[PDB]
Each structure stands twice: as structure tokens, then as C-alpha cells.
Amino acid sequence: DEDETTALVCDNGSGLVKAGFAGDDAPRAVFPSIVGRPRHQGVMVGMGQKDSYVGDEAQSKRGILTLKYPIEHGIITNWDDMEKIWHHTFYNELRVAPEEHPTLLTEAPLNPKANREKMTQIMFETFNVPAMYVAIQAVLSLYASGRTTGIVLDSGDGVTHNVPIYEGYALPHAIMRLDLAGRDLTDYLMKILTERGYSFVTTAEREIVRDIKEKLCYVALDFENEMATAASSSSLEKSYELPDGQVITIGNERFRCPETLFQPSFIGMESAGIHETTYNSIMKCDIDIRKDLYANNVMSGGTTMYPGIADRMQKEITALAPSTMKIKIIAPPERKYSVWIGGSILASLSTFQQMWITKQEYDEAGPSIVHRKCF
Amino acid sequence: DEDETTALVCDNGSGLVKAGFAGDDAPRAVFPSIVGRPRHQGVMVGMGQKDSYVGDEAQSKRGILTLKYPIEHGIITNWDDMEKIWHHTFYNELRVAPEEHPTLLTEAPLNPKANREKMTQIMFETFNVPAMYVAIQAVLSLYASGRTTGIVLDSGDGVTHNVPIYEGYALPHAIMRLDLAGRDLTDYLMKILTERGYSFVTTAEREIVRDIKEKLCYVALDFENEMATAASSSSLEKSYELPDGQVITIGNERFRCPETLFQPSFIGMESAGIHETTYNSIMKCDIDIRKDLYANNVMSGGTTMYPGIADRMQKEITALAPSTMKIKIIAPPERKYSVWIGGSILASLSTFQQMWITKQEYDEAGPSIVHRKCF
Amino acid sequence: DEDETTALVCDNGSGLVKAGFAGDDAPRAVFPSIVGRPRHQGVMVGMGQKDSYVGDEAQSKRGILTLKYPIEHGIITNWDDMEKIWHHTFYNELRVAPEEHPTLLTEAPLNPKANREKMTQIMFETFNVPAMYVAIQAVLSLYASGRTTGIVLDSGDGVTHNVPIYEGYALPHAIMRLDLAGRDLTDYLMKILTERGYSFVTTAEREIVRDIKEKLCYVALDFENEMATAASSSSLEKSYELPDGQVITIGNERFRCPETLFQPSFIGMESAGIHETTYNSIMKCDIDIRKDLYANNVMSGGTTMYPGIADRMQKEITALAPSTMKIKIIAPPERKYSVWIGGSILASLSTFQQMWITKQEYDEAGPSIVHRKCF
Amino acid sequence: LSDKLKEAETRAEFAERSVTKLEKSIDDLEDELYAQKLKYKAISEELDHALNDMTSI
Amino acid sequence: LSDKLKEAETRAEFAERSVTKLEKSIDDLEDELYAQKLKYKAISEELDHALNDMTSI
């Protein structure tokens, strides 16, 4: 299908998997990072029915499946389920076997080493990829956005890494890893929805709450004022259709879910929020770095698609940041897909052809080689 | 013409026994679950006269026989009479000996386990069947009806089981079994026909009422409005010919009997009826498995052949159901016989040839094997 | 009959309701949380006969009544039946007039708000109670158990709360709330008793199974070894006498019912089981919290009364827990009554007097006041 | 034939009733499709007309 | 009875065609309703989406 040995690119986290080939401007296919298994005893014979379901298969038949994510809080733990995901991710939908194509995968410097080691090892030992590279998602978001400098606040599914980069250099001492992410925002929402009479416990119920969140919730620019109205009037309530015909009406709960990003104490976290971490990543850097990082706060990844988040962050950051200086957010429509796009850009750069770990180097050094070669 | 060891299929209720061989689309013959015995003193001699009559023999000579049905609410208690029925069924009409063929018998999922153990034991120790398989009646209607998914409402002669099945899987926690069946409907009708001046008490009289019900009764869609006119005018009455040439004309009793299925309080049971049990089975299933069970209300067995029932059941579930959801009923002509048909289908599946208990496995394990091999 | 102008305490749930006055160490009486209504047509006249019966009245005359409870998995929906229960409980059984006494009612902290709002509203608007306080069941359990710290497993009729508390503080991010409870265990037992040949359908039949469960069921220390013998030999069977003189003999089913708490799949629930959810509540807490929660697994509510439950829970946690830590179950005689007792303690604490909502404050603020003063 | 007639009559009556149920359901679909179009394209197309103005400025 | 049967059976089969014609029309109207619902939905949502994106400016 490919007319060149183009690298394959995939952003595969605790949430979703985005994949396509280097040189495109988008993933060709997007899957959840899910492997599903039946939680019921079969009654009818000759029904087909799989032992395990992968990605979209897992969500489509979820009514009787338990759905697990092989990646949690930024790290792969279930390597077996990841092999099934990688095959589906790169071959079943793109029709490209990694054996003849280099592969670029993503993480961050505070992401435990086993993640980068298993990503590299699986593609080399199970898929026989000729080469590998592990990228920082912040690097890729900045390439996609047309920047070398900025803070990439990736507010994803299992972890927020908040990684500062200046003029193409990582500033790792200033990375603020926060135990608050989209999966926790889902948990908050089901607890507040329980307060309103709608309890969600099972896998199907969990996936529904994540759908409610993704389509109904918003950040807005001022939560105290938003709550003063949302808590007082039905005019800010929105109906969501549960896939059984029931309707759930969500009010100030509609923004109190994402509000956790500005109030982590809601889920038991000792933090003031993502704008505080953006501020601190910049603060930890020398002042001649800081001025450019404040002027280039970058949104990437998940949750960046909640209405009001790019503008709320600029307001919250300028409120912490020194005056006179211009504080600005970079938040293009190429948001959440900027990490994948940067992977395409990086994988295909002529200068990046010297940055790939080759299979021969891998076989000689072992799985730990990624720590010597990626960043 | 049986030159192949095809499995035999025999569905045995409190009402009728449907039997034929696997691979056909209908039972070859119906044995109406009966062993009859004379209740009078003989005076003439050299009259032949059996100690007991079986199946159609019991009905043909019923004028002086008491008719005993071996199965109560779908449970075989009089196993000796079932052996008489099975010998007659298999050898005289199907023209087969179970010794040369695998045999498939059926029962509701919550039917006490003793029943499935005896069905397995009898065919192996009395009939020397080379193999056995006790099937779920709900499953068999789904095969016959072209479904893998739906609520199967088996409103037959014995017990109404009501079991939700999704993608070929049982959802057993959502089974809503009712002690409401065709034999209670007949008793109710005998009492309300007594109110009209036609008392029915004894076996011959009981058989007449059962025949009246099957041919004259209906449910319609609105009981109270149907009663308002049935109780006011001869235009909703229907006449039935009694065996001795007398005629009984029946008015609102024509529907008051069938109505018991929707109003079980008519026979003293604390229940809301079959449409609420069907609805609750959908409700008790997971949130991502209800949008499919609403669209798949599946009929099984008899009473599904009452005029107005296909639409009343779809209507009652629709009335109980939330809006937005699509509610649909499956009520094929393969009614009152869909379970037998499913038995033929199941017995014959290539994927089912490993589900059969062989005689050697049975002899080594005993009757309890049915719970290890069938369900 | 009480000698002080004290507060009243009433732990009214989906199962049973316990009541007495603040300052005692036990409720005066426990009643089923039931309002009963006739399900039969009367024939004799001058027979008295109520439109509705409450508590002991509802159970005493149950032979001709259909019985309902007002609380659905911890949530009050039938506030009119709650009114009947509270009136009878306070007026006839505690022999007090709520108008002259503060009243304390209970609910899980994650219970939908309507529950706490109706408890506060009805006692103030229909009973004219001078003051109210909706209490947290986990708090009450710890006060009865002699603790400030631990995981409270109230494993009740409605819902299992499972909340970690440390030094008197809630740790809400770690509440592994679960929709698995005693009411499901009863329905499960009815289905498995049906498998053994003893069908149950009606309210009387349900009350009988509940009584069977409460006297015969147990958890055991090892489910697999217990079933290996119980399912193979009469030596572990125990009989129960049904009120009509029939005898039911129960084997491994005797423990399969409580086993459901550890194995939720038995009722179609997707859950790790009460011991793993307990483990996770401990593990979700900080390192300097975990050691104290391991040593303090705290029981309240029903189901904590099954023989072997305290010991199986301690074994399940120690088997998952790290070494060095001493894992302990707190399962005092105050079992099932831990919440009522705690209610008495809380209502009477001098440090709690300012926490009571007065009638004047209620009338000025309206029903929403419960969230300003209680929780 | 009397039974075949009663059965055919049941079928005829069934079909008359089934047709009646479907006369009702066709009219309900004729009215629901009508109402949905009448309110849906009329409102959402109107919302796109409003787009013509909403997105002005 | 043969003639009454022919009429009941003919009327039943014919009426059964009216059953399948009304039924088919109901399914087609439902597919149209669905498509209409889908377009309604798509339009209201496309506008609400775009409006949420464009509420600001």
C-alpha cells in the first residue's frame, strides 16, 4: 500500500490510540486503548464470539464485555494486550507491516522507563520493526504547532506531564507530573451524577460517563460566576441520551467535572491545578527561558477540546504570571492530534534519519537501548 | 428414511410433546404429554383393554379414562409415564430407536436440576441412547427465529421462564420466572364458563375447555375496552361445539382467560404479568445491552398464537419503555413450534457436535454429567 | 415511655429499620422497612382491615398482603411510606412525639441528595420536628466501633458503601462504592433454591427466603474447599423449616449466597468483590494512611453477621496486603447495630449540638439546608 | 372448510386488524415522518437560515 | 364455504399484502424518519458544535 518505506507513527496512551503513516497530516485510524473480554457464559452455540476484542471491536460489543486499558497513568503494564493493539493499530487498518517500516511512539521524561523500553522492545522483538524512536509528546506538539519553545500541557487520560521545551531543548527538571487526568475527570463526574440520582459502576456505565463528559462538559472562563448561574437556573442544563432511552440532565456538574483541572482537591490530589503546574514549569526555568515559555503556553492531547479550556488557561496563567509580559496560548484545531502530527513531521525529517534506533543496534544493546538513544 | 445417525429431537411440556428428527423443520408427530388410565369397572371380557394408553391413544379412548400429565410446570415427575411416551414417540411414529441416534431433550434454565439429570439418565439407561444433550428452550426459539439477541418469553403450558440473551450469551441474573402458564389459563376458563351455566370439572370437561381456549380465545390490545363491548353485545360472542352436540356460546370469557397472562391476580398470583416480566428482564440487563433487547422482544412457545398478542406485547413493552428506544417484537409463524425447530438446528450444528454427552462419558460420570456438559 | 427530652435515632434502610432514643446503647425495636397492602378481595364484613399496614403490622398480616419497601438501594422514593414508618416508629413504638424531640436519620455520603433532602423535609414539614441531622453511616460505624480510623464496610441491604476514614477525615477519592447488597443476595438465593427444587415467588415466599438466609447462610473461610465438600456430601447440609411445615435442605447454596459478595458475577454484576474493593480503598490512600487502614477494617450493617465473613475479609486483605503490616478485622457484637449505636453517640455528643438544623433555620432556608448543615 | 374459513377469516380478520394496526402505524409514521420533517428540516434548516445571520458580523 | 373461503383467503392474502405494504411503507417512512432525524441531529449538532466553537467570536 505504501510506495516508500515511510515510518509509521502512533500516539498510544491510557486513553486512545492514533495511527497513520509518516508524511500525512492526520492519523488514518483512531482506536481506544482497549482490549475487551466477555464477562458472561455463552448460552447459544455457533455464535462466533471472540475470546478478546481489540479497540473499536471492544467498544462495539461492550454490552457484555469487561473493558481494560493495557496502559494506565501513561505506562504500559499489559504488554500482551499491547501486542494485540499494535497489530490492529498498524496492520489491520493501515495494512502496513512494521517489519518493513520504522515506528515512532510517544511519552514524556517522567514517564517510568519501562514504558519506553516495552514500546521499543515490542516493536523490535514481536513486529521486527527495522527501527524505533520514542518521542516526547511535547516535542511533537511543538513541531505540529510551528514552535520550538513552549509548555506543553497535555492533560490526557491517565496523566498530565506538563513538559517545558525551550528552543528545541527539554527542560526536564521543570516537568510537573500531575495525578489528574481525563480518567479522573470521568470518575468525578460519575460521583456528582450519583448526587443527582444517576449511578454509574460497570464498564458500560463508565464508558457512557466518558461520552457524557466529552460532549456535554465545558470549562468556561470563570467557574464561580458560571456556578452562580448554573446552580440557580435550568437555562444552563443540558440533556444527554443514555443508550437505553433514559435521559440524564446535567447542570453545574457540566463544568464541575473539568473544573477539577483547576481544583484537583476534588479527587483527593494535593494540587492547585493545571494552570499552577504550567506556571511552575515555567517558574522552575531561568528567567531568559521563562519569558518565551509564558508567551507560548501550548495545549496538546486530551481535554484540550473542552469548550473554554484554551481561554480559561490563558486567563488562569496570566493571573499567576508577572504583569507587563504577554501570556498567550497556542491552541489550533490540530489540538489533541498535534502529537500524532508532530510524530509524522519528526519521523519524516531528513535530519531525523540519523535519530532512529536501528534493529541492529537494538539487538546488540537490548531493550534498555531506548534510554541511551531517544532523549 | 433414516439411513444416518441423526439426532432425535423431543420437546416435552405439561401440555404437548413435539417430536421428530434433527434436520427436519417440524416435529413429525405430536404426543400430547399423556398417559390415560380407565376409571371404571369392566363388565364385558375379551375386549382387549390396556392398563394405560399413551399419547393420542389416551385421547382417543378418553371417554372412560382419567388423563394424567407427567410434567408439572415444565418439570418431569412421572418419569415412568415419560418413558412410555418416549417409547411410543420414537418407535411408533418417528420409526427410530434412540439406541441408534443421539437424543436432544429440553428444559427452562431454572428448571430444578433433577429434571435435566433424569432426562439424561433415562435416555442413557432405559433407551441406551449413544449420546445426550439437554437444551435451553429459550435458545431454541432464538435459533428458529433468526436471533442471537432478545428477551425470550416462553408463555407455554408449564412455566413462563423469560430469559434475556445477548450476542449468544445468557444474562441469567435478569431472568424473571413466573408461575403463570397455559394450564392456569384453562383452569380459569373452566371457572368462568361455570359462571355462564356450563360447569367443567372432570377430565373430559377439562379437555373441552382447553380446546375452546385454543380455538376461541384472544387477548386484543385493550382489555377494558374489549370487555366493555363484549359484556354489552352478542357481536363479540363466539360459539363452540361440545362433543355431545351441545353448544356453548362464550362472550368476554373469550378474552378474560388470556388476560390472566397480563393479570395473574386472576389466578391468585402476586404478579404484574408477562409484559412486565419481559420488560424487567430488559431493565435488569446492562445499560449497553438494553438498546438491543428493547428492539428484540422474542416470542417462544405457545399462547403467542392468541389474536392481538404480537401487537399487545410490543405495545406493552413500548408503554413501559422510555421514548427514543425502538421497541420491536419477533413473532414468526414458527410459533408454538419454534423450540422444536431450534432443537433440530442446534442438534445439527457442526459447532455443536462436541456438546453431546456420549454414552461412555455418561456411564463414567453418572446423571450429574448434564451440568458439566449441557448447562 | 422515655424519661428525657433527648434526640431520637432511626436507621431506616431498604431492609429493616432500627429505632430508639439518643443516649441508649441499642434501639428499642427493629421493624422491617415495610408498608403492606391487601392483595385479596374481602368477603366477610366488620373484619376491621386496614388500607395499609406498617412494620410489624405489615409482616404480621402478610399472608394476604403484598409488601413494599420505600428505599431503593439506599434511596427513598416512596416518601409517603417513609412517613408511615417514621410515624409508627416514633409515635407508637418509641412512644414519642417528634414535635418535642430532635431526630437523627442516616445515609451514605455518596447517596443521591434527594434522600437527605426528603429525610430533612418530611421530619420538619409533616412531623414538625424541632431539629434535624442526617448522619453519615460511616461516621456512626466508627463511633460504635471505638475508631476514628478505618475502612467502613456497611455491606447493607441496599448498597455497600466501603469508605476509608483517617483521623476523622474522609478520604472520598478512595471510596469504592459498590452496587452489591443483601437484597441481591436474597434474590440470588431464591434462584439457587429453585435449582434445588424449592421455588419461591411471592412476598411471603421472599420473606421466608430472607429468614432462611439470615439463619442458615455463611461465608466460610475457603469457598473452594467448602464447596468441594458441601456440594459432594450431606455432612455440610442444614435444614430449615418453612412456616407450612415443609422442610428445605440446603448444601453449598448455603454459602453461595454470601459468596456472591466476594463473587459479584453470581448476580451479573461487574465487580472485583467486597474484599478487593476494600483493598483498593486502602491502597488508593497515601502511604502514611495505608498502614492504619490495613489494621482497621471496620464492620457495620447486615451481611457482616454471616459466619466466617469477618474472617474471610481479614484473610482476603492480608493475602493482598504487604508484609510487616498487621491486617485486622473489627467485627464487634455491635454488628448490624453499629450505625444505630453510632447515631445515639453522635446525637448526644456535646461537640455535635451545634450541628443540628433547627426548625427555624429549616423554615427560613427550605429543604436544601441539609447540604449546608449535614453533608 | 368451515375451519379453514374461520382460520382464513381469522387471517382475513387478522389481516384486517393487522392492516388496521398498520393503518394506524402508517398514519403514525405518516404523521411522525411529517412532524419530524416539519419540525426538523423546518427548524434545523431554519437554524441554517439563522446561520446565514448568526454567523454574520 | 369454498367460495367464502376463497374470499376469506383472498381477502386475507390481499389484506396481508396490505399488511406488508403498510409495513414496508412504515419501515421506509422510518428509514426516512431516521434519515430525517439524523439530518436534524447532524444539523443541530453541527451548528451547536460550531456554535460552541464559535460562541466566542
Closest chain D residue by Cα to residue E12: D12
* Whole-number Cα distances in Å, B215 to B209, B225, B255, D7: 10, 22, 12, 9
CA separation for the pair C106, C139 (Å, rounded): 10
Do E32 and D33 make contact, defined as CB atoms within 8 angstroms? yes
Neighbour count for residue B257 (Cβ, 10 Å): 29
Whether the Cβ atoms of residue A313 and residue A335 lie closer than 8 Å to each other: no
Chain A residue with Cα closest to E49: A215
User: Would you call E56 helix, strand, or coil by DSSP?
Assistant: coil
| B60: three-class secondary structure by DSSP | helix
CB contact under 8 A, E11 and D15: yes
| Angle subtended at Cα C181 by Cα C176 and Cα C183, rounded to the nearest 5 degrees | 160
Query: Given CB atoms, is A63 within the 8 Å cutoff of chain C?
Result: no
C205 to chain B: closest CA residue: B270
> Class for domain A35-68, per CATH?
mainly beta
**Residue A115: CB partners within 8 Å, gap ≥ 6?**
A74, A75, A76, A107
Contact map slice: D 25-44 vs B, CB within 8 A: none
Chain B residues lying within 8 Å of A45, measured CB to CB: 168, 346, 349, 351-352, 355
Domain boundaries of chain C, sorted by first residue? 4-34+71-134+337-371, 35-68, 136-181+271-332, 182-267
Chain-centroid distance of CA C35 in Å reads: 18
Chains C and E touch (3+ CB pairs under 8 A): no
Under 8 Å between Cβ of B76 and B82 = yes
Measured between beta carbons, which residues in chain A are less than 8 angstroms from residue E55? 307
Environment class of residue A272 by beta-carbon count within 10 Å: exposed (0-12), middle (13-18) or buried (19+)? middle
All three cell numbers of C95: 412512644
Burial of A230 (0-12, 13-18, 19+ CB in 10 A): buried
The CATH topology of domain B4-34+71-134+337-371 is Nucleotidyltransferase; domain 5 (3.30.420)
For residue D12, give the chain B residue with the closest CA: B307
H or E element that contains C329 = strand C329-330
Chains adjacent to D (≥3 CB pairs closer than 8 angstroms): B, E
Residues A299 and A337: their CA atoms lie apart, in Å, by 11
Task: Inspect the interface and report whether the beta carbons of A196 and C110 lie closer than 8 Å.
Answer: no
- Residue to mutate among B162, B165, B173, B271, with most C CBs inside 10 A, is B173
Written out in words, the top-level CATH class of the domain with range A136-181+271-332 is alpha beta
Q: Which of B254, B311, B329 to mutate to test the interface with D (most CBs of D within 10 A)?
A: B311
Interchain CB distance below 8 Å, C112 and A194? yes
Place of cell 412456616: C243
8 A C-beta contact, residue A310 and residue A223: no
**Cβ A259 vs Cβ A266: under 8 Å:** yes
Per this entry, what is the length of chain C? Answer: 375
Phi-psi region of C146 (alpha: psi -120 to 50; beta: other; left: phi over 0): left
Q: What is the resolution of this structure in A?
A: 7.8
The span from the CA of C161 to the CA of C350, in Å, is 27
The answer to whether A112 faces chain E, any CB pair under 8 Å, is no
Q: How far, in Å, CA of E33 to CA of B326, rounded?
A: 13
Yes or no, beta carbons of E26 and D23 under 8 Å apart: no
Of A194, A195, A203, Cβ closest to residue C270: A203
Spatial separation of the C-alpha atoms in residues B93 and B31, rounded to whole Å:
10
Which cell is C138 given?
460511616
Please give the Cα distance from A138 to A164 (Å, whole number).
8
Q: Give long-range contacts, CB 8 A cutoff, 24+ apart: B203-210.
A: B203/B62, B203/B65, B203/B66, B203/B67, B204/B62, B204/B63, B204/B243, B206/B67, B207/B59, B207/B62, B207/B67, B208/B242, B208/B243, B210/B186
Buried b (16+ CB within 10 A) or exposed e, D33-52: beebbeebeeebeebbeebe
Give yes or no for A311 touching E (CB within 8 A).
yes
From C196, C201, C267, residue closest to B179, measured CB to CB: C201
B174 vs C267: CB contact, 8 Å cut-off? no
Tell whether E54 is within 8 A of chain A (Cβ): no
* Partner C contacted by A66 (CB < 8 A): yes
Note whether E53 contacts A311, CB cutoff 8 Å: no
Of the candidates B109, B175, B142, which has an alpha carbon nearest to the alpha carbon of residue B330? B142
Interface contact C201, partner B, CB < 8 A: yes
E56 touching A, CB under 8 A?
A: yes
From D52's Cα to the closest Cα of chain E, the distance in A is: 11
Q: Which residues of E10-41 are buried (b: 16+ CB within 10 A; e: fewer)?
A: ebbeebbebbeebbeebeebbeebeebbebbe
Q: Which residues of A touch E56 (CB under 8 A)?
A: 311
Nearest to A281 by CA among A171, A149, A204: A171
Strand order across the beta sheet in which C163-166 lies: C169-170, C163-166, C150-153, C297-299, C329-330
Chain breaks in chain E (C to N over 2.5 A) after: none
Query: Roughly what angle, to the nearest 10 degrees, separates helices B137-145 and B338-347?
Result: 90
The number of helix segments (H) and strand segments (E) in chain A equals: 14, 18
Q: What Rg do the C-alpha atoms of chain B give, in angstroms?
A: 21
Determine the residue among B161, B270, B370 to mutate to test chain C binding: the one whose Cβ has the most chain C Cβ atoms within 10 Å. Answer: B270
| Distance between CA atoms of residues A151 and A138, nearest Å | 8
Distance CA A66, CA B366 (A): 36
Alpha-helical (H) ranges within chain C are: 56-60, 79-87, 113-125, 137-145, 182-195, 203-216, 223-230, 253-262, 274-283, 287-294, 309-320, 338-348, 359-365, 370-373
Contact A22, A95 (CB under 8 A): no
Task: Establish whether domains A4-34+71-134+337-371 and A35-68 are of one fold.
Answer: no
CB A52 within 8 A of CB A84: yes
Q: Which chain B residue lies closest to D11 (C-alpha atoms)?
A: B307
Q: Are A111 and A81 a contacting pair, CB within 8 Å? A: no
Please check whether the domain covering B182-267 is classified as CATH 3.40.50.80: no
* B182-195 vs B203-216: helix crossing angle, rounded to 10: 100
Residues in chain B: 375
Q: Which of C103, C87, C79 is nearest to C21 (CA)?
A: C103
Q: How far apart are CA A185 and CA A96, in angstroms?
A: 35
Taking Cα atoms as reference points, which of B194, B348, B170, B298 lies closest to residue B256?
Answer: B194
Taking the C-alpha atoms of residue A208 and residue A230, their distance in angstroms, rounded to an integer, is 23
Sort out which chain E residues have CB atoms less than 8 A from A218's CB and list them: 52
In angstroms, the CA C81 to CA C71 distance is 9
Mind spelling out the 3-state secondary structure of C19-64?
EEEECECCCCEEEECCEEEECCCCCCCCCCCCCCEECHHHHHCHHH
| Edge-to-edge strand ranges of the sheet holding A297-299 | A169-170, A163-166, A150-153, A297-299, A329-330
**Using CA atoms, how far apart are residues A191 and C172, in angstroms rounded to an integer?**
10
Residues of C in Cβ contact (< 8 Å) with B179? 199, 201
Report the C-alpha gap between A7 and A343 in whole angstroms. Answer: 10
What would the grid cell of residue A146 be? 510551528
Closest of B108, B105, B110 to residue B120, by C-alpha: B105
User: Which of A43, A205, A247 faces B168 most closely, judged by CB atoms?
Assistant: A43
The beta-strand segments (E) located in chain B are 8-12, 17-21, 29-31, 35-38, 53-54, 65-68, 71-72, 75-76, 103-107, 131-136, 150-154, 163-166, 169-170, 238-241, 247-250, 297-300, 329-330, 357-358
Q: What is the rounded CA–CA span in Å between residue A299 and residue A331? A: 5
Determine which helix (DSSP H) or strand (DSSP E) holds A123, and give its type and residue range.
helix A113-125
DSSP class of B50: -
Which among B112, B173, B269 has the least Cβ separation from residue C196? B112
Closest CA to B164 of B147, B148, B151: B151
C183, HSE (Cβ side, Cα atoms, 13 Å): 18
Rounded distance, CA B342 to CA D47, Å? 52
